Design a protein around this ligand. Structure first.
Ligand SMILES: OC[C@H]1O[C@H](O[C@H]2O[C@H](CO)[C@@H](O)[C@H](O)[C@H]2O)[C@H](O)[C@@H](O)[C@@H]1O
Ligand code: BEF
Ligand SMILES: [Mg+2]
Length: 290
C-alpha cells in the first residue's frame, strides 16, 4: 500500500465491548456511517444503520454521538428521532440525547470572517464549473466534487493558499481540506473539543472519577476533521497512562480511534476499516445483528 495502520481487530473490539460497562460511541456520519456520494442531500441513513443505532442505543450501558460537519437541520432530519447525541458543523453545536435545544459553542465567537471567506469562495466557484458554496450557520463549505478533477483540484489548491495567506492570518479560523471540499470554521471549536467534553465527563450525563468515566470508546471517521477526534482520544489515553490508572483485562483503557479508509491512509488512528460497509459490519457485530 504500503500500509500505514493495521486492519481493525474486530474480535478484540467485540471482547472489550462485552466486558465494558460504560460505552461511548463517537461516530462521524459522512463517509463513515454512509458512503460518500455526489449529492449531499442523498447521503441518507440505511435501514441497517438505523437498526444498529436502535439496538445499540437501547442498551443503557451505551451512549452514542453523531459528530459531523453537517449543519443542525440535516442531523435533526436524519438522526433527530434516534436515541443519539448530535454535534454539528465540526464542533460548533452540541445537542444532548435528552435535550430540546442545541448549545452553540461558537456563540461568542467573531463571525466577520464569513463574508471574506464567502467572497473568496465566490471567485473560485466562478472559475470552477460544477462547484458550489454551502453556507451553514457557522462553518462554510466549498464543494468541487462535481467539477472536472484536474481544474477543481488545481483551483482548490490555490484557494487553500489564498485563504491561508489572508483570512487565516487575520482571524483564528481553520482552513480544512476535506474530501473534494474546503471548509472554514473557527479554530477553537472542533471535533476534538467535542470528544473531550464527552469522554472526560460522567457517563452519560448531560453537558454543563474512574467509575463514571467511559471504559469503552469507539470512534470512527474518514476525513481530516476526524483526525481531531483521534488526536483528542490519543491525548486522553496518554494522559491516563501518564497517570497510573489501572488498565482493563486487555492492558488498555478501551480507547479505539479507527479511521475509515484504505490501509495506506495516513492517520493517527490505531486501525482502519476500508469503507462504511465494514463499519456497519463491525457495529452490527457489536449489536448482535449480523
Ligand atoms: O457524501 C456527500 C458529501 O459528503 C461530504 O460533505 C458532507 O459531509 C461533510 C461532513 O459531514 C460536511 O461538512 C459537508 O457540509 C457535507 O456536504 C463530502 O465532503 C462531499 O464531497 C460529499 O458530496
Ligand atoms: F459527518 Be462526518 F463530518 F463526515
Ligand atoms: Mg466524514
Amino acid at each position: 500500500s504500503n500500509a500505514y495502520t493495521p486492519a481493525l481487530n474486530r474480535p478484540l473490539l467485540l471482547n472489550n465491548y462485552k466486558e465494558s460497562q460504560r460505552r461511548l460511541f463517537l461516530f462521524d456520519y459522512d463517509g463513515t456511517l454512509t458512503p460518500i456520494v455526489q449529492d449531499p442531500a442523498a447521503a441518507i441513513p440505511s435501514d441497517k444503520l438505523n437498526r444498529i443505532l436502535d439496538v445499540l442505543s437501547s442498551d443503557p450501558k451505551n451512549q452514542i454521538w453523531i459528530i459531523s460537519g453537517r449543519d443542525q437541520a440535516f442531523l435533526e432530519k436524519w438522526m433527530g428521532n434516534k436515541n443519539v447525541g448530535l454535534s454539528a458543523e465540526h464542533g460548533c453545536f452540541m445537542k444532548d440525547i435528552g435535550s430540546k435545544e442545541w448549545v452553540n459553542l461558537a456563540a461568542s465567537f467573531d463571525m466577520s470572517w464569513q463574508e471574506k471567506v464567502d467572497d473568496i469562495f465566490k471567485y473560485y466557484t466562478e472559475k470552477t464549473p460544477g462547484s458550489n458554496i454551502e453556507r451553514k450557520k457557522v462553518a462554510l463549505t466549498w464543494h468541487y466534487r462535481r467539477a472536472d478533477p484536474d481544474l477543481g483540484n488545481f483551483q482548490a489548491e490555490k484557494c487553500m493558499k489564498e485563504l491561508n495567506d489572508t483570512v487565516a492570518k487575520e482571524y483564528d479560523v481553520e482552513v480544512m481540506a476535506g474530501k473534494a471540499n474546503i471548509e472554514v470554521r473557527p479554530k477553537f471549536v472542533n471535533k476534538g473539543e467535542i470528544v473531550k467534553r464527552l469522554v472526560l465527563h460522567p457517563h452519560g450525563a448531560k453537558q454543563e472519577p474512574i467509575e463514571e468515566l467511559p471504559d469503552f470508546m469507539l470512534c470512527l471517521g474518514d476525513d481530516l476533521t476526524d483526525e481531531d477526534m483521534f488526536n483528542s482520544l490519543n491525548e486522553i489515553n496518554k494522559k491516563w497512562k501518564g497517570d497510573n490508572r489501572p488498565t482493563n483485562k486487555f492492558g488498555s483503557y478501551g480507547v479505539y480511534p479507527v479511521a475509515v479508509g484504505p490501509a495506506s491512509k495516513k492517520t493517527v488512528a490505531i486501525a482502519h476499516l476500508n469503507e462504511p460497509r465494514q463499519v456497519l459490519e463491525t457495529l452490527g457485530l457489536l449489536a448482535g445483528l449480523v
